[PDB]
């Protein structure tokens, strides 16, 4: 009944949360842009983060982050 999907991000979030708290912000969001280092940096981070923190609270936790990779499909 169960499937391999949560375990994937479960390990990603742990490594993604360099701040060590449980949520991701503009600071950590850079972790994805750092791989490209394109112009999107210092700009796209503020617009991209909007995807993760789609709760209107001011931070993204282990949940909405799963929607990120979801786009990969």
């Amino acid at each position: 009944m169960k499937g391999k999907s949560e375990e994937e991000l479960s390990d990603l979030f742990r490594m993604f949360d360099k701040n060590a708290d449980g949520y991701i912000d503009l600071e950590e969001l850079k972790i994805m842009l750092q791989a490209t280092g394109e112009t999107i940096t210092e700009d796209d981070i503020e617009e991209l983060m909007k995807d993760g923190d789609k709760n209107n609270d001011g931070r993204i936790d282990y949940d909405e982050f799963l929607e990120f990779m979801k786009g990969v499909e």
Binding site: E8, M32, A35, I40, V72
Partner: peptide, 20 residues
Amino acid sequence: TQKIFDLRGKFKRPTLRRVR
């Protein structure tokens, strides 16, 4: 308009091929 860049790739499944 793109949004996709690396973030998408290498995010399907963890594969490890041993030298064997």
